[PDB]
Every structure is written in C-alpha cells, then in structure tokens.
Paper text:
In contrast, R-spondins (Rspo1-4) are the sole secreted potentiators of Wnt signalling and have emerged as crucial regulators of stem cell maintenance in vivo and in vitro. At the level of molecular mechanism Rspo proteins potentiate Wnt signalling by alleviating the feedback inhibition effected by the transmembrane E3 ligases ZNRF3 and RNF43. Although necessary, binding of Rspo to the E3 ectodomains is not sufficient to stop ubiquitination of Frizzled and enhance Wnt signalling. This further requires simultaneous binding of Rspo to the large leucine-rich repeat (LRR) containing ectodomain of LGR receptors 4, 5 or 6, which are well established GPCR-like regulators of stem cell function.
To obtain insight into ternary complex formation with ZNRF3 we solved a low resolution hLGR5ecto–mRspo2Fu1-Fu2–mZNRF3ecto complex. This complex is very similar to the equivalent RNF43-containing complex in the overall positioning of the three different types of subunits. The RspoFu1-Fu2 fragment is sandwiched between the two receptor ectodomains which do not contact each other. Thus, a Rspo ligand serves to heterodimerize an LGR receptor with an E3 receptor in both flavours of ternary complex. However, as previously proposed by us the ternary complex involving ZNRF3 adopts a clear 2:2:2 stoichiometry in the crystal lattice due to dimerisation of the ZNRF3 ectodomain. Compared to the relative position of RNF43 in the ternary complex, each ZNRF3 subunit is rotated 30° away from its partner LGR5. We note that dimerisation of ZNRF3ecto and consequent 2:2:2 stoichiometry of the ternary complex would not be compatible with the exact arrangement of ligand and receptors as seen in the RNF43 ternary complex due to clashes of the membrane-proximal regions of the two LGR receptors (not shown). This rigid body shift in the position of the ZNRF3/RNF43 relative to LGR also requires a re-orientation of the Rspo2Fu1 domain to maintain the β-hairpin 1 and 2 mediated interface with the E3. Our crystallographic LGR5–Rspo–ZNRF3 complex, albeit at low resolution, confirms the 2:2:2 stoichiometry that we had hypothesised would be favoured for ternary complexes involving ZNRF3, as opposed to the 1:1:1 stoichiometry seen for the corresponding RNF43 complex.
Numbering used by the authors:
A (entry chain B): 39 to 141
B (entry chain C): 53 to 205
C (entry chain A): 31 to 485, 539 to 543
Write the structure that this text describes.
C-alpha cells in the first residue's frame, strides 16, 4: 500500500510525491524505498522548499524530535529540555521539575 | 566485457554463535566504467535520488557496501543531478565496494556507462537484466540482510 | 472491547493513556462516540468539510491533535473548548483563508501550532490571546503580505517561527516587539525588498536568522541589536555591499551565508571580532583593493577570497591567521609574498591567476601539512632551489603558464600531481626517478612526456 505517491513501484516504493507531500527515504536493513508523508517521523524535521520538501535527520545529541537543524523539541529518556538543548543537570537560575522532565 | 558471477548468500545466526547459509546464483556483466575485479560485501540498496551531491550532507554507511540501484524509465527523469556514471562515482565515494545497476527499465545506461572507459573507477561496476534482475529484486524486497559475492572469471 | 472507533487503530501511551490513529480513512465527519483518555489523535487526509455536527469537548487528556490534509474552511469559536492539555496542534495542508478569529484563544497549554501550507493571508489581532505556552509556530507556504506585529505582540513565549515561502515584502521597525524568548526565525523564500533599521530590536534571545532566497537591496543594518546571534543566512539576494562595522554588534557569530549576492565593496573592518567564526568565502568582490583586518578572529580554518584587486599582503598577516588550513587567493593582483611560515596547519593553497614574479626561500618554509599548491597563470620568472625543500606532505603542484626556464628538483620528492604546461622555456627533460608515485602529469612538450614512458598519464 504505497500511499500518497504520484509514481509508485514495488522495488523503490513511492517516488515523486503527490501534491504537497514530503519525500522521505526509509531504510530497513539493506532495502531502501521512498515514502510520501505530510509530517516527518520522530527524529527528523521538515525542510520546505519550492520544489523539494524532505525530512532531514536531527543531529542534536540527546534529541528524539526537533524543530530545525539546531533546536530540539523532545529529548530522550532521562534528559531535561531547556531552550532547545537537552541536559542531564538543570542549569542555575531555575530547578528541575520531574513531572514532564523539563526546567 | 567479461561475465560477472553473482552469489547472493542468505544466512541465519544460530543460537550457538555459528551460522548457516543458502547460496543463490545469478549472472550479469562488468561495465568498463569500473574495474574488472572481484568484490564482496554487505548489500545496501540505494534509491536513485539518494545519490546526489546537491544534498549538503547525507546518511553515513559502513564502508564496503555492495550498492544495488534500480534505474527508472528514461523519460521520467529529464536531467538527473548526476549521470549514471556520476552516481556510481558518488556510491564509491560514499563507501561502495561495488555497484550493481538493474538495467531492465533503461538500456541506454549501458552506452552511457561504457562511454568513460579511459578513466575507470577504483571499484567494479556491474549491470543486470531480465530474469536474473528479477531474482535479485525478489531477495532485496523480502529479506533483511544479505551478502553479495561478485567474481571475475 | 472499549470505545476505539470502528476501522481505526489504537495504542497505549503510558498506562490507561490512549493514542488513536484514524488517518487516511476518508471520514466525512469525525466519529460521534469517542472515548475520553485519548492522549494522541491523528485525523489526516480524511475529506473533512466542517467540525462538527457533534464536536467533542470533555477530552481533557488530549495531548496531540493532528488535523492535516482535511478540507477545513474555518474553525467555529467553541470548537476546542474542552482541551486543556492540548500541547501540539497540527493544521497543515488545509484550505484555511485566515487564522481562526476567536477559536484558538485561551488554549493555556498549547505549545506548538502548525498552520503551514494553507492559503491564509489575514491574521486577526488577539487571535493568539491567552496562549501562555505557545513555543513553536509554523506559518510557511501561506499567502501572508506583512508581519502581523499586532497579533504577535501577545506571543511572548514563542521560541521558534517560520514565515517562509510567503509573499512578505517589508518588515517594519519593532515588528517582533514583545517576542523576548524568540530564538529561531525563518524568513526565507519571501519577497523581502526593504526592512527597517530597528526591525529586529524586540528579540534579544534570537540565535538564528534565515533571510535566504529574498530580494534585499542593501545589507540589513537591523542586525546591529542582535547580540545572541549565532547563525545568519542571507544568500541569493540582490545586496550590493557590506558596510564598515557590519557585525560589530554580533560577537559569537559562528556560521554566515551570503553567496549569490552581487557584492562589490566590503568594509575592511567589517569582519572584526568574530572569534568563533571558522569559515569565510568571498567570490567576485572586485572593489576590494587592500587586505581586510581580522583582529579578534584568529580561528578561521578556511579563507577563500577571489576576483578582487588586492595588491600586497601585510608581513604579519599569519600572526592574525593561525589555525588556518586552506587558502585560495586566486584571480587577484598579488606581487610580493610574506613568509607564510607562521601559518602552520596549512593544507591547501591556490594562488592561480595572480601577478607573482618570484618564489623566494622563506616564503614556503616549514609547512609540514601542506598538500596542494597551485601557482598557475603567474609570471614566475625564477624559483630558488630550496624553496620547496621543507614540504614533506606536498603531493599536488601546478605551475602552468609561468614562463619558467629552469626547474628546482630539490625536495618535493615523491609527489603525485605535477602540471607544467605553458612554461615554454622549460625545455629540459625530467627523469622517472626523483619523482615516484606520479599519477597525473601535464607537460609543455610531448618529448618530455616520452621520458616517463608515454608514447600514469601525461598530456602534451
């Protein structure tokens, strides 16, 4: 069920996405195939351009979901969020609050 | 020029730590775009769009991966980021020990591949087609991992 | 068992919390009997005209609502009354012509709101009123005309915003007044022609700015106020010149992009006090006559400056430039050269199409990491024998079209690339030994290539 693709194939999956869908290369072992989705998966962020909307990975340490290249949205387990950066110990000025793992 | 003997080896890690294997036999041919050498490594299928220098930074792959690329119908992509030659150049740059193009959809790539024989790459470039190309994609589609074995007789 | 709507798929978040997925079902309207305890709802690509015949408050646990790709025209004012725990709302790829006038008000816990890829133009004032928690906002690929300063003045909690792919043509003074917490601002792919001199005076926490793919005419001098600025992008504009003391107000700048700009003049003290800046690239700055001062910015690893009229260099230029690696000053008017020996950690040099006449002894001493050196299209009459003596890592060399008569063999042993085409006075042959590992060669005469074994490659 290769959904949301204007052009599809059994070997490459989706290709050249439909309307205003983000194109995303998913990998499972050796196999790679295209996917056409509106919101990027957890660990990636949507970069919009006139003719190329793709999901680039968040390379922010201790981050599970991010807004941009250098701003985290959701940290990993056992990490406190603060101004887009993920920490172990909450900086001076304000203390931790473990209900949501934030400062 | 010379026939390429491809061995797609499926394996299973037994609980004791040992392995058990199952060999499959295919046939292609070495393009003079690449070297006339034998090669072996972990298979990694690559989507055509993935091989472009246009992307500033891409995903890293463990060095020594046998690239597998399904070409599309010629008229669907008017101008690529790089030609079939250039995409193989990207693959070898990105750590490919060998590149295998499924050519069933586009025979004109063969003329474009064998064009640059004066400046061949470090690593071998191979192509496949027909029932052999179908078997390859059937293993690539369904299985998790597989080691390719290209040998030059 | 339990009310998980028919056809949909359900899953547990924490225990007794529920995550629902009714995406790509093509539902005319949302299901009537919906279970409370839903902490995630996904209604994407469903052909939903309105909301609703029976809209559902009392789902106070809802953390994330996705409502993308639906045919939503407007939002009734009492639509999201029940949701007090709504943290992230997704409303992209709908046909909204404006931000709901009073429907999105007082969503106390709303932290992110995706309103991108719609056809919105107007943003009514105080539509975001009472949004104390709103950190993130998407407003890209819409039909905006100006910055809704009046609406954004309530959003003091905003940390990120994207107004890209819009038709915004002007940024007024104090356009983002009360946004003290704003860190990221993306304004790329707009028609931004002119902006005020105090247009970014509101945000103090702003670290990144994206003004790429725009129609700016002059350098943005609103930059002055932004102290916490780290990344800046304004490439693909029609900006003409960088003024003197351009980045004086923005120390701790790390990355800057400004390519595809017709930059003619640049101030000599414009790039001072940028200690954490690692790379600099200037192409086609024709009106630069003298070398720029780089005081308080000694951590430049890559300097490339081409297409200018630089006459000569300071003799203590390498005191300012340690930690430098690559140096491309091609297509300039350089004559005399400094020591270059203090510039250690140098790896690449490209001084092609200059007006250099002589290579001295000390001009390339103790550059142990230097691999490549291009001196093509110069007027180099004579080279001192031990000029290339202390370059062990030297592999690539290009001396094409230099008017050289004799050759210095001393040092430079076992280098990979050598180009000598154009040196018409260079008539003597070169041996195979004294030059192992030669893979690419260019030679001004064909009989010289025959010495190496060519009737490894050699071009006549």
């Amino acid at each position: 069920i290769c959904k949301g693709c204007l052009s599809c194939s059994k070997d490459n999956g989706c290709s050249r996405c439909q309307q205003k869908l983000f194109f995303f290369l998913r990998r499972e072992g050796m196999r790679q195939y295209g996917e056409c989705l509106h919101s990027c998966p957890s660990g990636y962020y949507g970069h919009r351009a006139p003719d190329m909307n793709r999901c680039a990975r968040c390379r922010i340490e201790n981050c599970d979901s991010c807004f941009s290249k250098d701003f985290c949205t959701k940290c990993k387990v056992g990490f406190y969020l603060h101004r887009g950066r993920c920490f172990d110990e909450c900086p001076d000025g304000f203390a931790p609050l473990d209900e949501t793992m934030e400062c | 020029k010379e026939t390429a003997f491809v061995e797609v080896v499926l394996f299973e890690s037994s609980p004791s730590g040992d392995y058990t294997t199952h060999t499959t036999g295919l046939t292609g041919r070495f393009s003079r775009a690449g070297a006339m050498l034998s090669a072996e490594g972990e298979i990694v299928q690559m989507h055509p769009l993935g091989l472009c220098n246009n992307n500033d930074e891409e995903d890293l792959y463990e060095y020594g991966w046998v690239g597998v690329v399904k070409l599309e119908q010629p008229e669907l992509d008017p101008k690529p980021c790089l030609t079939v030659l250039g995409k193989a150049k990207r693959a070898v740059q990105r750590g490919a020990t060998a590149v295998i193009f499924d050519v069933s959809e586009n025979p004109e790539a063969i003329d474009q591949l064998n064009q640059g024989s004066e400046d061949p790459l470090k690593r071998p470039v191979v192509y496949v087609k027909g029932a052999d190309a179908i078997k390859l994609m059937n293993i690539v589609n369904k299985q998790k991992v597989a080691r390719a074995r290209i040998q030059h007789l | 068992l339990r009310g998980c709507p028919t056809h949909c798929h359900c899953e547990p978040d924490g225990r007794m919390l529920l995550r629902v997925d009714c995406s790509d079902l093509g539902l005319s309207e949302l299901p009537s009997n919906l279970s409370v305890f839903t902490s995630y709802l996904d209604l994407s690509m469903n052909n939903i005209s309105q909301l609703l015949p029976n809209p559902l408050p009392s789902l106070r646990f809802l953390e994330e609502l996705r409502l993308a790709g639906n045919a939503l025209t407007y939002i009734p004012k009492g639509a999201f009354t029940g949701l007090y725990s709504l943290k992230v709302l997704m409303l992209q790829n709908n046909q909204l012509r404006h931000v709901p006038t009073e429907a999105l008000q007082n969503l106390r816990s709303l932290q992110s709101l995706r309103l991108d890829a719609n056809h919105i133009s107007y943003v009514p004032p105080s539509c975001f009123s009472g949004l104390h928690s709103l950190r993130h906002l998407w407003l890209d690929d819409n039909a905006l005309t100006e910055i809704p300063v009046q609406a954004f003045r309530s959003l003091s909690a905003l940390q990120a915003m994207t107004l890209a792919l819009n038709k915004i043509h002007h940024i007024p003074d104090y356009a983002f007044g009360n946004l003290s917490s704003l860190v990221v601002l993306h304004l790329h792919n707009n028609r931004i022609h002119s902006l005020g001199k105090k247009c970014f005076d509101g945000l103090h926490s702003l670290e990144t700015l994206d003004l790429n793919y725009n129609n700016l005419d002059e350098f943005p001098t609103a930059i002055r106020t932004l102290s916490n600025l780290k990344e800046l992008g304004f490439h693909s504009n029609n900006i003409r010149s960088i003024p003197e003391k351009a980045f004086v107000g923005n120390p701790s700048l790390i990355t800057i992009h400004f390519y595809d700009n017709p930059i003619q003049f640049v101030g000599r003290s414009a790039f001072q006090h940028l200690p954490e800046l690692r790379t600099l690239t200037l192409n086609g700055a024709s009106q630069i006559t003298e070398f720029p001062d780089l005081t308080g910015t000694a951590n430049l690893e890559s300097l490339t400056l081409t297409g200018a009229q630089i006459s000569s260099l300071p003799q203590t230029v390498c005191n300012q430039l340690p930690n430098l690696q690559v140096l491309d000053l091609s297509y300039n008017l350089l004559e005399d050269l400094p020591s270059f020996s203090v510039c250690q950690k140098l790896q690449k040099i490209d001084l092609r199409h200059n007006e250099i006449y002589e290579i001295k002894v000390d001009t390339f001493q103790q550059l142990l990491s230097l691999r490549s050196l291009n001196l093509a299209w110069n007027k180099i009459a004579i080279i001192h024998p031990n000029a290339f003596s202390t370059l062990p890592s030297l592999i690539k060399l290009d001396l094409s079209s230099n008017l050289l008569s004799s050759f210095p063999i001393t040092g430079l042993h076992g280098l990979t690339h050598l180009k000598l085409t154009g040196n018409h006075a260079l008539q003597s042959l070169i041996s195979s030994e004294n030059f192992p590992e030669l893979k690419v060669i260019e030679m001004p005469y064909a009989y010289q290539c025959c010495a190496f074994g060519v009737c490894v490659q050699c071009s006549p």
